[PDB]
Amino acid sequence: GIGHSTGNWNCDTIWAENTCKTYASRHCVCLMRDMDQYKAIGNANGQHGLDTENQTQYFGFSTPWNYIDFNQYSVHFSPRDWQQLVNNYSRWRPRAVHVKIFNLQVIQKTVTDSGTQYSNDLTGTIQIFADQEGRYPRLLYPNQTTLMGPFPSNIYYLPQYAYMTSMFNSGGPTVSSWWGFPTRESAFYCLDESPSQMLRTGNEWETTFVFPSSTQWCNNKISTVSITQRQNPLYDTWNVNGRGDDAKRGNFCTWRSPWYPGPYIYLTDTSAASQRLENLANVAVGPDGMPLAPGMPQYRSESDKDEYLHTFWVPKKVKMNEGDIRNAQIDVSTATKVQVDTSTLYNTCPRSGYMSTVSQGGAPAPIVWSGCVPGMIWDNRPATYFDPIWQQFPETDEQFKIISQLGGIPVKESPGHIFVKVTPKPTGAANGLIDEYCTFTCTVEIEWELEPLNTHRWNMRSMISYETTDAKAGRQIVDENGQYQVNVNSADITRLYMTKRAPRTN
Amino acid sequence: GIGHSTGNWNCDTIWAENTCKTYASRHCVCLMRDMDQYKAIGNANGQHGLDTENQTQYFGFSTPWNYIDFNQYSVHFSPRDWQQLVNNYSRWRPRAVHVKIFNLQVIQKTVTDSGTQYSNDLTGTIQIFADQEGRYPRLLYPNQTTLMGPFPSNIYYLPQYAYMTSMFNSGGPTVSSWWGFPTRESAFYCLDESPSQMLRTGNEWETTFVFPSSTQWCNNKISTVSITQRQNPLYDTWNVNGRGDDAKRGNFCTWRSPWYPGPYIYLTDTSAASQRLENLANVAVGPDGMPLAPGMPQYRSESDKDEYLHTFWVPKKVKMNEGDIRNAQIDVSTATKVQVDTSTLYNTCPRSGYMSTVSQGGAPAPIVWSGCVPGMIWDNRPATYFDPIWQQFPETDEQFKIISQLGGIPVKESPGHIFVKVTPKPTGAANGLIDEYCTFTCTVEIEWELEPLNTHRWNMRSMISYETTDAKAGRQIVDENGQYQVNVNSADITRLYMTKRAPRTN
Amino acid sequence: GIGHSTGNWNCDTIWAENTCKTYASRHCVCLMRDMDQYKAIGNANGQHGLDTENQTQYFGFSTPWNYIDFNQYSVHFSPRDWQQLVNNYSRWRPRAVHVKIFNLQVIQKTVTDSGTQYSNDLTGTIQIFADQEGRYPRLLYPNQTTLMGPFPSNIYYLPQYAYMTSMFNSGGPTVSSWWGFPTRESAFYCLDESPSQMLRTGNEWETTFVFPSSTQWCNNKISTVSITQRQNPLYDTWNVNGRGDDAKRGNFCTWRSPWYPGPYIYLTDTSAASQRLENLANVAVGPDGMPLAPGMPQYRSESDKDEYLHTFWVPKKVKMNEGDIRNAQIDVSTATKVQVDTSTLYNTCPRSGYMSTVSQGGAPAPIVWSGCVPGMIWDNRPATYFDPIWQQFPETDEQFKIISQLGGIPVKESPGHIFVKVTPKPTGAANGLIDEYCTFTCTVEIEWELEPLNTHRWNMRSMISYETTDAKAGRQIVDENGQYQVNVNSADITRLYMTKRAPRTN
Amino acid sequence: GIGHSTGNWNCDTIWAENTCKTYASRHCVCLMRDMDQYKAIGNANGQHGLDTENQTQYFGFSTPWNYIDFNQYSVHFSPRDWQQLVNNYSRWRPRAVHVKIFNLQVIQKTVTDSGTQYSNDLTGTIQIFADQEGRYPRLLYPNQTTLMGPFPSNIYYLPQYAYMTSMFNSGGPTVSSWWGFPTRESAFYCLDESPSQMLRTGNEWETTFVFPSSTQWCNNKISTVSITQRQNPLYDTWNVNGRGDDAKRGNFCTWRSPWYPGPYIYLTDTSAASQRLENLANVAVGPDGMPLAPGMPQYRSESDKDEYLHTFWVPKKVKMNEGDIRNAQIDVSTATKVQVDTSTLYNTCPRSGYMSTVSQGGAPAPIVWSGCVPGMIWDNRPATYFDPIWQQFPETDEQFKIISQLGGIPVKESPGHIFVKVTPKPTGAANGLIDEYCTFTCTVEIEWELEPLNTHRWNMRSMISYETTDAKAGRQIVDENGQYQVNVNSADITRLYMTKRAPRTN
Ligand SMILES: [Mg+2]
Ligand SMILES: [Mg+2]
Ligand SMILES: [Mg+2]
Ligand SMILES: [Mg+2]
Ligand SMILES: [Mg+2]
Ligand SMILES: [Mg+2]
Ligand SMILES: [Mg+2]
Ligand SMILES: [Mg+2]
């Protein structure tokens, strides 16, 4: 009946030898969206202006549905879980994802002369279905504010599910209306067409996703030797140097290499005002295009250059109940700009671009774009505790070495969206519904496959170490006001939240 | 006891239908290294000057241990073995590697008023362990002087095992000390930490390595038709020419191609004095960088251009007992500079760079870097009898089409180093050891998987043929002084030692 | 469903021969704490001023969770239960602790123009977990106001769980901020990370703790002979007196003793105003320190000296519903200062300090600190009905004869905290929750192992006896206003509530 | 026969879940001692002068025998082994000790006009016996130079076994002869009276010791809360403050404590010249006495005060072959004075001495000696990588809480000495022996029982982390000269080599 709990809270992380199982429980608010209406959404302005909102053209639909987005490490791992993971394991990948929705409460809001009264709707339902068929558009973009909070007691407002569809603008960037955008390929999806479980309070819901065995790993390995220095220092080579002459002793950089470092793309960083996407390094795709930053993983000496480094905001502090952040922009003052530095890429990755000329005898010049040629080896950018766990990629005919420089394990199969909405309860009058929302507990269980790191080096290795400065800074703890304070800067991510800690000998 | 041999000499090559088994026996000297001390080694100078020694910065360790390096074809194949291999087989790969160490003799050297006396230390031991776990740094660089000699009676001095580790120079290229180089990732490896067999005379040792079935093949196939000429000459095509017009009869080069040749990188060759790595076509990686030569396999008409051709020294003659060559540079006058020409790449490989412009209607210009695009097909550089058999690559997150332009079958798993050192026998006094070294016989057995070549062409095919000029030049024979004389020039490698002899019909 | 009770009220005490089982049922209020937020708490002022609040520096966290603290005798025993226990048994210890939580009611509070309305939230949950792993900080301090009331009908407000963590102050006692205090060892604990049962009304919860068999006993034995007088009075000894001379008849104090009394520490009592911890007998530990009172158990003739006597407040009266006492100081006028006198220690314990000199022939002087030397025997301070049952001690490397002079059976394993919180029910708006709290019945069952006292003395023994003065004083009964009135003074504890009643013959 | 090795080199460390097995192999030199003579040894001077040699009086015997001393962590663990141990495990203890002696070589030294010639004595024997019965005096003193070197390739010269016996000096400290010292209790032990294995080359020897299950653990736990702060910060206590008054809110230091910190002894540090033992804090025992430093474990703010901190020399660098160090004093310039700081004792240990007075109302004064009183809890000093593994204590009637402030797990049963000597081979002439010594390989295998650390704190914990400064300093690596360079200072031991890293929650 209505008096028995349908599930239990678990945020724990359970470590086994080669596996860990993470539990993420959140108290979840499912708000009714747009009076249970699908709405066509769009933006007519295509000027692609940086620093100014609504400059890309799109056509899409916001659904009345909400969905659950747990894809980040900070959701499923406590900071010491992350410390244990990155310090002790050379790689890891998610295996099974189990999501439970339980302890449903549909709450009727009623407005009275005094405040809003909250009453249980005992027979109220919510509708839940997991879309694992790819029946509906997947929202692929990482680290969007749709995510659960890192802290267990963060109230999670399920984001409203909305998607963009194929548009075509015959007009310019300044077109006033976006109703010229829809194309015959533009697809409206009614999620109400899908079969969905209806749940009263006392009903529970669960779904399982299993990652394929082909799922790639998040690699924690760092190379302890330059790929250029793999020769024996005490011996000459029969190979010649770069220009074909004698390879000198102890001058190894001049020796011809059996391999190349990874590809390299020169990217620019502009500080100027009123710059468009076309002022950045970019490529035009479909309606708009994309910038090329951060680009190919490459060692950078500097801690701040944002065009070559994966750069993202992390919230300084996290309020427990932030409310619904739909259509809300992250306040700049509440976050910090952090850049994941490539210092861990020093041994395996190009420090500069490939330098060559077509002119015979000409001085080698930097090559804007060096695509993958046979014999390239490179390491990926380090993951962070704030990165997505996986990155689903769009279905295309052809992929090459799929990786997101933004983060996540590139996957061709990922947990589908779990769509939730409060069943509309109409008042019997036109254009009206009984005001109500759902609260429930969602536990996300992730099976993790771990590979413990193995190093026979004599000397000690670096570890992620929580320090007194970290505690005085208030990292990974709550403040006096109840806010879980991340308090992260780029140097803090190097020292705490980066992967590629595990020294690799080969 | 001490009076029975622990093994037998075998240098033979045994041919089966799809397999050959090579035996390489060498009389092996294991010298004590640095009084059984691990030493930190390094070079402070980073100016990367070509033509001048000690211009790359490195930090590493020389171990007291010695290791066995057999990775070259000339070690395991006689010249006629190579002739039989390259003439009769379209491809080959190593399968199992078996190494025997037997007939150990620990020899005590004692200095007397008259000369040095040599006595057996009958209870002296050597320590041997194969590192197949990748526990210790692998020395990946091909054709380093650590190799066994091509001739069976060459005395093989086991090279001292030394490696370079991650360094970081905050200073410039001119820094005086290399003790600023070590980093927290820099790993000292004590090989004495590994379990190792101790062997007296009368003990034998063996290890087996099996290449994975995923091991790539050394390909002996040459294309007998240009990839551009694969159309039927007698018929028109419905396809258009390059600019979209009628495809004319018997003008096939102008027809649009179903495929592209391989990637192309323009490289420069500089003859100037006092040139650094940065004057060559190159890329910066970690502490130093690498030159880009020879680059992508591409047909070259000329016999000598060293920047596009795999170029290496081959010794003119090989002394049977050369002594320990540790820290010795190959004498320029004792070797010859040979360049493996790409004439066998004529049909499958780009003869020039890709020629295109961004400017509409502009004249096509050479493209410095053409990375792999979908639809590229190409052939690898031909292997030589003097190439490594395999090339292990560094462990990285990501590889693309691993190949060494220097040679060898690119492998992700290769025989690990077999480490050998004389057990230190101390005198009972500080800083002193009984002077002693080990002689033993090492047999390296390699199983080879062969694919016999199949050609139905009516006319005869080219063969590697030993000629009277080869005999008068003294190739593949000893001279009057007992030196096995290779006497090779670039033309000699084309005619004798190159692969890609097997005509491929498709 | 919601219409069936999940448990029954039991406060009874059931006596068996060697065992009693106590039941403590309380009507329990679980209040939501700090809007379900973990808050960092601390005090910056370290002046350690007596008589003034907030003079110790600490850093810690208050959790949204509540916990159950039943550790006191007056909770589990009625006064006659205590009378029966102390009169009839030489010792007792707790064996099993069983806690039931049942008849849950989540009550929504709503504010209206007229008063606050209280409605059942029928699907509301609370979260409960017992932490028996020591996963979370145990609150070790005895007789803190977190306790249940002595009387069955006392409404028990579960205390908010909060803990202090390692701090380090580089500043002085006057530092303005406590955010300098956290250290790398300072640990924030999220109790929401633990798996916890969610319970609706109609769910019940229970946990069991079993004390180890190694659990010490609360000893009710008093010695009926001085440890100094254990000789036969009618006979001389061959032993000498204290200075080595003849041991005289009937002068036994001068005879050398086979044993010593317990250790002795001189403590001071200061009445002066504006005294700090450093004016008291004390020791500095970590951030602050501790006073040394009451110190080692020692006979005191006087009824009031608080530095040598276990001293604590007992409430004069106990209101049935006192409300939530979080952050509330006991009102001085509502309690009485009672001192447990050591009169029962007269025979076994030092009446003064050890008196000796280093100077040969010098007059013996009192020794400030006499630590345990071989041959010391002593009795513990008597327990009271108002003492804790057990005292858990902090985990340390080394313990010596663990005992709390404050009370309780020293234990290395005790019932863990049972953490309870109302599941936050959000309003769907930022920073807000439906105002609600839980009422439930908690029964604490304790198995007690008893040892009946055995005395063969001819004459009667003293007993705890309720007297007409006790009834006229209103002890152990309610007053006319419904308050359960303890009405205890030091003399009242000697006569009624002390242990060590059981005469021990040996 | 003589041509087969009797064992294999293993220095490896093998980690299992709850166990690790360490292998320590050393090349071991057994030198003939004193021409196979037992000699009476002694020192007549008893002035106990600090800073001057031979100031203690002793009588004893040096035996012709050598023994094996492996008792230190740095012998059996590589630095990363130590890092893995201290970072991942809350405690550890040794379980079984297995010692192998194999690959024996008896070497005859012969003097010739040119140098010394070294020849195998093939039929030469050494004598080995393990004394596990306690038949012979155990050398109990920790960290004496008799130890094996930390690095695997350190040549280990077995120390000559010598012991001191009961002496009594009726004279003064200035007596000229020590032949007055022997007493009827003074015991000469002939180790040649024991049965011992004789081994030729081709014989191997092994012994096993199993630690009792009662063996204590090396504790890696640090407390994350002060033992003074274990109360709930949000609640008042019924307990009174130190002087018996109201316990104020947030002033916890003034509350009476359920426990005391550990014992405290005030120690002095004198810098003056020509000071004797009697100028230091000390106690006279038997012939001489002992100083009291470092004393009871107590938190010290300062990094350098040597009287309260465990203080010892660590060698800056370690030569591989140092020769025989018998009767050799550590060169001051070759070591560093390091002090293990008590910062990890901050929460559990007294920061100052107990402060009290006998005078009523008198100001509390520091108490020179506070011995253990009931209710004391404390933590031990942290172990270091350079500490002994165990400390055997002398057999006595009575022990109290045996611990060495110098280090090691206090044990009543430890591996006995393995005594080795070269069998004297006489020349057939009076007072002469064929000059010979033995080299052999000794492997010491230790089974370790591990307890993995378990912490549920939300935030990260501190870790031992090898840093770039550590690598630039050359720690845990060899230098360019082949010396294994420890390069340790007090701050380096805090950060790298100390135990008590594992945060303990309770
Ligand atoms: Mg050239
Ligand atoms: Mg050279
Ligand atoms: Mg055209
Ligand atoms: Mg045509
Ligand atoms: Mg006398
Ligand atoms: Mg008498
Ligand atoms: Mg007082
Ligand atoms: Mg108070």
Residue numbers in the entry:
A (entry chain A), B (entry chain G), C (entry chain E), D (entry chain F): 30 to 535
Task: Quote the original article.
Parvoviruses are linear single-stranded DNA (ssDNA) viruses with T = 1 icosahedral symmetry capsids, affecting both vertebrate and invertebrate hosts. To expand the architectural repertoire for the parvoviruses, two aveparvoviruses affecting red-crowned cranes (RCPV) or turkeys (TuPV) were selected for structural determination via cryo-EM representing two species of the genus with ~55% amino acid sequence identity comparing the VP2.
In the 1980s, ChPV and TuPV were identified to infect juvenile chickens and turkeys, respectively, and as potential causative agents of enteric disorders, affecting growth rates in poultry worldwide. Following cryo-EM data collection, three-dimensional reconstructions of both aveparvoviruses, utilizing 405,850 RCPV and 35,131 TuPV extracted individual particles, were determined at resolutions of 2.66 Å and 2.35 Å, respectively. The short threefold protrusions of the RCPV and TuPV capsids are primarily formed by VR-IV and VR-VIII. The VR-VIII loop of TuPV contains an insertion of a single amino acid relative to RCPV, whereas the VR-V loops have identical lengths in either virus. When superposed, the surface loops of these aveparvoviruses are nearly perfectly overlaid, with only minor differences in most surface loops, with the exception of VR-III where both ChPV and TuPV adopt a different loop conformation than RCPV due to a 2 aa insertion. With the technological advancements in recent years, cryo-EM is capable of generating high-resolution maps of macromolecules that allow us to discern fine structural details, such as water molecules or bound metal ions. The bivalent cation at the side of the threefold protrusion is coordinated by identical amino acids in RCPV and TuPV, including D262, T263, D272, and A273 (RCPV numbering) of VR-IV and Q355 of VR-VII.
